[PDB]
Design a protein that fits this description.
2 copies of one chain form a homodimer.
Chain A (H helix, E strand, L loop, with lengths): L5 E3 L6 E3 L2 H6 L8 E6 L2 E6 L7
Antiparallel strand pairs in A: 3-4
Organism (chains A, B): Bacillus subtilis (strain 168)
Protein name (chains A, B): Putative transition state regulator Abh
Keywords (chains A, B): DNA-binding, Transcription, Transcription regulation
Amino acid sequence: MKSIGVVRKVDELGRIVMPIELRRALDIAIKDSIEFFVDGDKIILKKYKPHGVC
Amino acid sequence: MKSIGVVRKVDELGRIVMPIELRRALDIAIKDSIEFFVDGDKIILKKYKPHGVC
């Protein structure tokens, strides 16, 4: 149970379902843009347009 | 371009495709487990089995 407290089980390829919370928190509509970071044993997500920088 | 430097376009619901990098990073096999955190304008991912705690 994290901030969103939601867990997903991978499709197969690694495709999962990010929640409305993510869309709300960020700026997601239907196709948007999410770019990820990986920190050791952690993953990070951002909307591409905002931030701009890595 | 983040650590992975890959960006995804949402399916419609918010479903996107997390990469093999994430599977390698954590412990993803086919269904595995990914639980996310949201920090202001950021998202965080973990495999549920490891960590245990939030």
